[PDB]
Design a protein around this ligand. Structure first.
Ligand code: HEM
Length: 153
C-alpha cells in the first residue's frame, strides 16, 4: 500500500509525462524493444519494425504508446483503487496477447528508465521509489487477476 505522499510523487512526474504523452510513449516502447527484443515478438502489428528509426517513424506505434500510457495514467490516478480498470486489461493481456509478468517487469523498467532520463526534476530517488512501488502494486494485482483468469503469467 502506497502512502498519499508516495502517490503525490507518482502523480507529480506523471503530470510532466502528460505534457507530451505521445513522445513519452515512443521513448518507452522503443526502450522496451531495444532492452528486451523478445517483447517485440508479442506485437503482430509491430514485429516487422527493424530499427529505432523505423519505430520512431511508425504512426501506428505512436498511437499505441498513447493508448498504453493513457491506460496506465488512469490506473495511477486511482491511487490503488484500480479494480475496474485492471479487469479488461488483465483479460486481454492474459488471454489474447499472452503477456507474462516478466514482460510487465520489462516495461516497468523501461518506464522508469525514460522518466529518469527525461525528468530528473521530478524523478529523484524518492520519486523513483514511489513509482516503483506503484508499478509493483500494478504487477501484483495483475498477477492475482491472471491467476483468477487461468493464465500462469
Ligand atoms: C504498463 C503496462 C501495459 C499497459 C497499461 C498496456 C495497455 C494496453 C492497452 C490499453 C492496449 C489496447 C486494449 C487491449 O488490448 O487491452 C494494449 C494492447 C496490447 N498490448 Fe499492452 N499494455 C501494457 C503492457 C504490455 C506489454 C509489456 C506487452 C508486450 C510485451 C503488451 C502487449 C500488447 C499487445 C500485443 C497489444 C495489442 C496491440 C495491437 O495489435 O493492437 N502490453 N495494451
Amino acid at each position: 500500500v502506497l502512502s498519499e505522499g508516495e502517490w503525490q510523487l507518482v502523480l507529480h512526474v506523471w503530470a510532466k509525462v502528460e505534457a507530451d504523452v505521445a513522445g513519452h510513449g515512443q521513448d518507452i516502447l522503443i526502450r522496451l524493444f531495444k532492452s528486451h527484443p523478445e517483447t517485440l515478438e508479442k506485437f503482430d502489428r509491430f514485429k516487422h519494425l527493424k530499427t529505432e528509426a523505423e519505430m520512431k517513424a511508425s504512426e501506428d506505434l505512436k498511437k499505441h504508446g498513447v493508448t498504453v500510457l493513457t491506460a496506465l495514467g488512469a490506473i495511477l490516478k486511482k491511487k490503488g483503487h484500480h479494480e475496474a480498470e485492471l479487469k479488461p486489461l488483465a483479460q486481454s493481456h492474459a488471454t489474447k496477447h499472452k503477456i507474462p509478468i516478466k514482460y510487465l517487469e520489462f516495461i516497468s523498467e523501461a518506464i522508469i528508465h525514460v522518466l529518469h532520463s527525461r525528468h530528473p526534476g521530478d524523478f529523484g530517488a524518492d520519486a523513483q521509489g514511489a513509482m516503483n512501488k506503484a508499478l509493483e502494486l500494478f504487477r501484483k494485482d495483475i498477477a492475482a487477476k491472471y491467476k483468477e483468469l487461468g493464465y500462469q503469467g
